[PDB]
Design a protein around this nucleic acid. Structure first.
Lengths: 105, 123
DNA sequence: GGAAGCCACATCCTCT
DNA sequence: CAGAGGATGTGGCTTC
C-alpha cells in the first residue's frame, strides 16, 4: 500500500530481526542505520526501486526535518531521531519499547 | 509593444507594461522568463517595485524575491517565484506597486494559475 | 470515469 | 564519503 519512508523504518525498528542493520540507540526515539546499504536495499525492495541506496533514502529523511517527523543527530553517522509523537502512535514510552526489543544501550 | 513583440502585455495602467507570464506554473519553480515591469513614463532609476499575487482564494499569496529596482525604465525581477497556490481552476491577479512619490499601482488580472504540480505530462 | 490537485518520494546535483 | 538542500519528473490518491 502507500507506505511512507518513516513508517517503513519504524516497522523495521519494531521487528527484532532487523536489529543488525537498524536499531534504537537507547536514547528516546533516536535510532541508527548501522548498515545503510541493507536498509536502502530493503526500502528499495518495498517500493520496487532496485536502484535505491542510502544516498537517496537519506534525501527522503531530509525532507522530514522541515516537517518535524524526523531530525538528524548532528555528529553521529547514520543517526536520526523521530521527533513526532510516537507514544501516541504506538502507545509506549520509549523506555517500554526499548525493553520489549531488549535494546542494549 | 514593438521592440519585443510578444514579450509584453498591458497592465490596467497606461504608464506600465509587464512581461507575459506563463498561463500555469509550478509553485516555487523559477519562471522561464524573468518577470519585468516596464515604465513608459519617467521613473527614476532606483525606484522600488513589488508585486503581490492573490485572488478569491488567497487575498495574499506567498511569493519569493517579489522586489525589484527600476533601472532605466525597467524593473528586472530576479528569479521571482510563486509559493502559495491559487486554487483549482483559478488564477492570481498581480498587483504591481511602483514606489515613486506618490506611488503608482498597476494590475495584471487573471495573470497566472499556480499549483503544486504546475503544467504536467498526462498520466 | 477522468482531468486537475496534493503529497511523497526518486533521481541527480552542487556545496560544505 | 556523510550530509544540506535545490530542481524536476513520477506514482498513488483525492477532488470535482
Amino acid at each position: 500500500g502507500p507506505i511512507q519512508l518513516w513508517q517503513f523504518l519504524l516497522e523495521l525498528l519494531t521487528d527484532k530481526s532487523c536489529q543488525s542493520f537498524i536499531s534504537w540507540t537507547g536514547d528516546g526515539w533516536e535510532f541508527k542505520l548501522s548498515d545503510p546499504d541493507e536498509v536502502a536495499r530493503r526500502w528499495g525492495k518495498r517500493k520496487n526501486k532496485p536502484k535505491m541506496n542510502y544516498e537517496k533514502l537519506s534525501r527522503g529523511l531530509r525532507y522530514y526535518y522541515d516537517k518535524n517527523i524526523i531530525h538528524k543527530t548532528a555528529g553521529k553517522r547514520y543517526v536520526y531521531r523521530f521527533v513526532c509523537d510516537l507514544q501516541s502512535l504506538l502507545g509506549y514510552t520509549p523506555e517500554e519499547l526499548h525493553a520489549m526489543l531488549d535494546v542494549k544501550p | 509593444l514593438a521592440d519585443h513583440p510578444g514579450e509584453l502585455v498591458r497592465t490596467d495602467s497606461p504608464n506600465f507594461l509587464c512581461s507575459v507570464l506563463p498561463t500555469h506554473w509550478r509553485c516555487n519553480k523559477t519562471l522561464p522568463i524573468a518577470f519585468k515591469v516596464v515604465a513608459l513614463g519617467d521613473v527614476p532609476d532606483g525606484t522600488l517595485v513589488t508585486v503581490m499575487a492573490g485572488n478569491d482564494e488567497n487575498y495574499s499569496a506567498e511569493l519569493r524575491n517579489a522586489t525589484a529596482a527600476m533601472k532605466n525604465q525597467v524593473a528586472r525581477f530576479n528569479d521571482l517565484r510563486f509559493v502559495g497556490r491559487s486554487g483549482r481552476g483559478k488564477s492570481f491577479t498581480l498587483t504591481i506597486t511602483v514606489f515613486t512619490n506618490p506611488p503608482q499601482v498597476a494590475t495584471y488580472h487573471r495573470a497566472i494559475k499556480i499549483t503544486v504540480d504546475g503544467p504536467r505530462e498526462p498520466r
